[PDB]
Structure formats: C-alpha cells, structure tokens
Symmetry: none
Subunit: 205 residues, 4 copies
Amino acid sequence: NGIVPDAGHQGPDVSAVNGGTQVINIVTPNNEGISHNQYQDFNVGKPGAVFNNALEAGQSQLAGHLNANSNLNGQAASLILNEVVSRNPSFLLGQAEVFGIAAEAVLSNPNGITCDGCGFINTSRSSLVVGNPLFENGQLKGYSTLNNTNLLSLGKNGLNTTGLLDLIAPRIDSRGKITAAEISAFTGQNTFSQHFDILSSQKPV
Amino acid sequence: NGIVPDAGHQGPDVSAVGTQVINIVTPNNEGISHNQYQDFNVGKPGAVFNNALEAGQSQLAGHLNANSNLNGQAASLILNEVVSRNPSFLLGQAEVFGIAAEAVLSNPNGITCDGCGFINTSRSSLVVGNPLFENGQLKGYSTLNNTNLLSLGKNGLNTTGLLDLIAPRIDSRGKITAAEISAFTGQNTFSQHFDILSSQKPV
Amino acid sequence: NGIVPDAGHQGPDVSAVNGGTQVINIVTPNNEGISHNQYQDFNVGKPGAVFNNALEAGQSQLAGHLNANSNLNGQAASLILNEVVSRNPSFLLGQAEVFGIAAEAVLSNPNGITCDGCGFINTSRSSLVVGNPLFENGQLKGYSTLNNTNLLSLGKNGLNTTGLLDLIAPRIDSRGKITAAEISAFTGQNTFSQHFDILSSQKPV
Amino acid sequence: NGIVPDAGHQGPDVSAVGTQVINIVTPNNEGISHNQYQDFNVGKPGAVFNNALEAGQSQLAGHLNANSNLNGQAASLILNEVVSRNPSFLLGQAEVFGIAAEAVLSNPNGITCDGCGFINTSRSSLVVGNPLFENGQLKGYSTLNNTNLLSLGKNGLNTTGLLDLIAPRIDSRGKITAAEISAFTGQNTFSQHFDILSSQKPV
C-alpha cells in the first residue's frame, strides 16, 4: 500500500502479510540480472518491505515463509532496480529485505527520498538515488541527477546497511547515524556509470 | 593444477592463464550451477568463475570470453562441491567474472583460508560439510558426523560482500574483513540460508 | 548485580538505574589511559551496562542522565580493561556502552565468555579475551590464553559492534552474526601484545 | 606553514619534520586540550598531534619526543578551533601520537576533506561551526547563523575510528570510510556528544 507498482510490464506485484510488511514480487530480470521495477509510489513503513528474489520457497526475516517468485525464470536478480516514475517522493521508515538470492538494490526517485530508520538486509550494495536511471538500447547505462534540486534526507533514526552504500542526490541532509562499510556520497547535478563513477557534472554559469 | 574437476556432467572445464579459469556448468531451474571437484585449491594467483554472457575484462585473469556452458542465463548461486577426500587450501582470491552471483565452497574434509577472498560475489560461503539434495533440488547443508576444521590463517580473509563460515570447528590466526559475517560451528543441518534446522549432540 | 566488583583498589562502583541497566564507575586510569577494573562477576543482561568514562555530566544512551565519574581526575580512560579474577564465566546478553569519552574496551575472563546479543557502543575497538592480561612492573604488556581450554561462545543473537573487534580464546564457537568492521580472531593457547599481535604459541608435543 | 597557531595561551607549538607536529596545549580539568589557530590546513604529508608522555615512534613523522606541555597527563579530547576567517583544507592524515584521544576540528568558515583521515583517534569530528563555552567549560557546538560548507572531495575521508560530520551544508564527491558515521546538517546547537539541542529555522 505504501508501495504501488506502475501499470505496465515493469510493475511488480505487491502484497502484504502479517504486521503490514509489504512483499514485492520483482519483475523478471533481463539476462544481465537487472530486475527493472517501476512504481507510482515507493514508501516503506516501520513494518518493512521484502523483495522476493527467490527461486525456491523459504523463510524471510521480515515476512515469514514465502514461496518462490513466479516472475523469475531460472535466474534471480543480481541488481534490483526500483524506479519511481510519478511525482511522489519516497519515505523509508523501515527495513527493506532481499529474500532469496542476495542482490544489489537501488531506489531511484527524482522527487526526493527521506530515510528515517530505513535499512537494507541481504544486499551486497545499496543505493539511494534522487535522480533517474539512464538507458540506451534498452540497457541500463548509469544514473543522472541532472536538472534536479531535490533532496535525500536522512532522519534522526538514521540508515543501517551492510557493505557499500551509495548516497546520490542534488542535496543531502542528515540528522543521525549512517551505518555501512563505506559510503560513496555524491551531491550536485551529475551523471554516473552503473557503478556510480561520476562521468560528468552540470554547473551553474 | 590446484582445481581439478570431477569427470561427470557436473565437472566444469578448468584451465590456467597461473590464475585458473573455471567455466562453471549450466545452472538448473533453481539458478544453481552445481560444480563437483576432485580438488579445489586456490593459489596466490587466484581463480575466476566464468559467469559471463559477453566477453570482458576480469580482475585476476585478464580478458576472457563468455562462458559457452551458459545457455543464455547466468548462474544465481555457484555451488562448488569437493567430492573426494582432499581438503581445500585457499591462498588467493576467487572472482566471479561476468554477472555477480552467490558462491559456496563445500568441502567436508576441511577448508583452509590464508589470504583468500572473494570478488564480485554478493554472498560467499565456506562450508566444511556437504550440500543436501532432495529431488535434485538443493535443500541446505550438513555438518553432521564431522570433526574437520575451517582454519583462517595469518593472511586472513577479505571480501566486500556478505560471508558465511560454516564448520564443525573453526580455528583462526588472522583478520576477517567482510560486509557481514555469519559463523556457525558444531554438527548441524542448515537451510540454504544457513538457518540451523537440527543439531547432533553426544548421548 | 550481574557485575560485581573485586574488593580492592581495582574494584569499580556498580549501581543500577531504571530498567535494570548497570552503571560502572570505572577506576582511575593510569597515565597511559588504562583503567584496570577487576571483578568477581561480569555479566551483562538485556538491560545492558554503561561504563562511566565522563569528566562532565551528560546523557547516556542506555542509562539516561549520568554525572561525571568522580574516580577520573582530569583524564578519561583510553582503554577500559575489565578483568574477571574469580572462577565465574561471563554471560553478555545486552549492550555495553562507553559513556563520555570514547575508548577501547576489553573484557578478559579466563573462565569463558558467552555473548548472545551483546554489543558495544561508543567504543573504538572491542576485545573479548578468554585469557588473562599480562603485567610487568605494573604496566599492561599484553594478554595470554596459555594453559587454558575454555570457550568464547557467540550465541544465536550474535554480537554487534563498530570498528575493530578482537575475539581471543582457546576455542571459539558461534551460532549467528558478528557485526564489526574487521574481526581479528585468534584461537589456541598464545601470548599477545597490547595490540593483539601474536607473540608466542603453546602447542602440544 | 598550513597550521598556524594563534598568539595566546591557547596556541600550541607547531613545527615541521613537511609533516607538521603540533605540541597541543595542557588539558584542563575536563580533559580538553583547547587549541586555537589562525590557520588549520593539513597537506599530503599529514599532521601529528603530540599527545605523548614518553618518546616513541609516530606513523607520519618518525621518532618524536614527549610533549612537554603535558604535565603528567595526556589529553582526553583534543579540540582544534580555527578563530580567524580562514577555511580549513585537509589533504592528508591527522595522527594522535602517544595516548589515543578524541579529536575535534572546528572551523565555522568551512572545512574541505580531500584525502584526509585520522589515526589513533577514538572519535574524530569535523564541525563547520563554533564550540560553545560556559564558565570556561566546553558545553557543545553551534552551527547557528552559518551557511558554510563541509566538502568531501574525490580522495575521500578515512579513519578506523568513530566519525562525526557537522555543518550547515555538506557536499561530497567521494567515499567516507569510518567505523561509524554520524552526520548532522543545518543550523543547530549540539551537546558535546552531538545530540541536537536546538535548531534555527527561517520565519
């Protein structure tokens, strides 16, 4: 309910289980392992959210027993790309868990992202991008925060993840603790590779 | 030389460049590339699991081609199972070239890590134990009826990814660097995600 | 009450505040910053424990407002060394917080240490040593697990800290997640420097 | 050259070896060595705060003597306060030689970190703001009535210890490596432990 998929082929199925935890059945990844999910809304409440990246049934940490994600056809996602395509900013107030095969997770929302006690579980790398993914010939090429003044805001209850965290936004505000192994933080209006290497920058004249 | 595949359908093709390149076997419908070996040892030059659909640049072995054993899909979990009585010695890095994946090494005879590590691996696991199958599907792992050791040597273990260490006993003389470390000792059975499902105790 | 100081000059004062959280007024450090505390019992319950390493009053995370530690005379501890001198093994089931000036914290208990949901807050380095500190001419020289078969046991709820964690014991058992930046783990019967570099080893003949 | 002490009782003695060695001032009864500067800039050779009671080997500056400004006690918190209008540029490592301590750099004019880091520092803090005193005791910090920037450059920031980053605004183009990172932006006042006590907002 805080997570509302886009209508087309890139909108994943969203359900909820006991406690309110939302379960996202991510869309079929391409052959490079990218599951490109599109949303009208992407907000995570205190009950948290689970990306079902599992090819067999099992036990998730936030949502109990889940079956396999029937959208996966012999390959799990290696990168779970979550892209908000409406004007609605994102509010992340609980944990997002990758259930099944560990993967990288990206949330892009050019309207703004606020993380207050948010977090990522079973993810090798996590990225919050106040910006858009860039595509060419249908392949992910990187990310853009060009022509954007919106904000990535880390609230008092902070952000908890493992491994690599990318924080990519025109502006970044913070009011608490950021738990991760390394943080790559890039402010300003820029374009980036898929690995968040900076490729170009837009500067006032 | 250090990595020797086993003769059957589940033996990958292995060559050197001393860095060894393993063209892992085709993954099954659960995303598992199940590779079996008579020996699995990584030297200082390291090893590369070729999980690539297009040619490209590997960190440890230079420029490599696609793995033709894959039929249009990369593996999701690369399972490397030693089926002989030979323990594993890991003295260099193991890299997944191509599409990142999880990797597991199972060797019920013992595993020694001394300067080993994992590259481009979302979650890596070292299991002094055996995988459990049922209907040809991976069900978990077993350290039952086993007293062998996972040993971490002076030069330690490094990965930027998630790490699980599973063995009847663990010895250590060095540093473990990982995004997250789960370690489980004793004689147990496990799910695929290393939840302990049962434990074996003396009378 | 789970923490019982030794009687002599190296026994710190222990009190409890709302919820049961214990507050340790660590003994005066020497000039090198080592506060050498000795205990008959060192057990931390789910309510947690706080080392008062503060030279001014302030707000602790686990125990509310605390006054300055009157044992400190113009210098806080740089290393809080907690040494169990009885035969009683330690059970750590909650967080240990350093209140005041951040410091290194060491618990040595040659009888055994079990950590099940234990953790360290505001510590630059944390060490659990199933072994004894070594002293010469009244100075800390390092640590010993010689002539010891006892166990460091990490339970299902795991261990959470920041930065460097040393796990030093004849045997180490584990059943869960160990959260830290790096873990230096040394099994066997050994002697170590103050920085946990191995100096010697005892091996069966 | 990059670090210039201020003329009074609270100006430390500063020399080079290009690595600069700062013999910080005597700590007060709350353990604070309060040092004031007309300039505080660290170059690629780095800087050393001498917090030692005995001679010994520093990582960045070779063999150094005890800091005679200490009267038998090392500092607990090393507070480095820029009192001029000059921003700080940190392009190398700052090391506490001797007894580990916390370190704070306050410069309300701006701080730029580009390859900077902290060694042997239990908790380090960069504050684009001023310390607050009351009765000559440190009470906290203030970023009020300030629009200046903490900027993290391409070469990033590294420490094995705890880190606080406090500024009206933070810009970044690189990686932060620390045991724990707390970051607080905006116009605020803080306690000594960086709990926000108040905030300044436009009408």
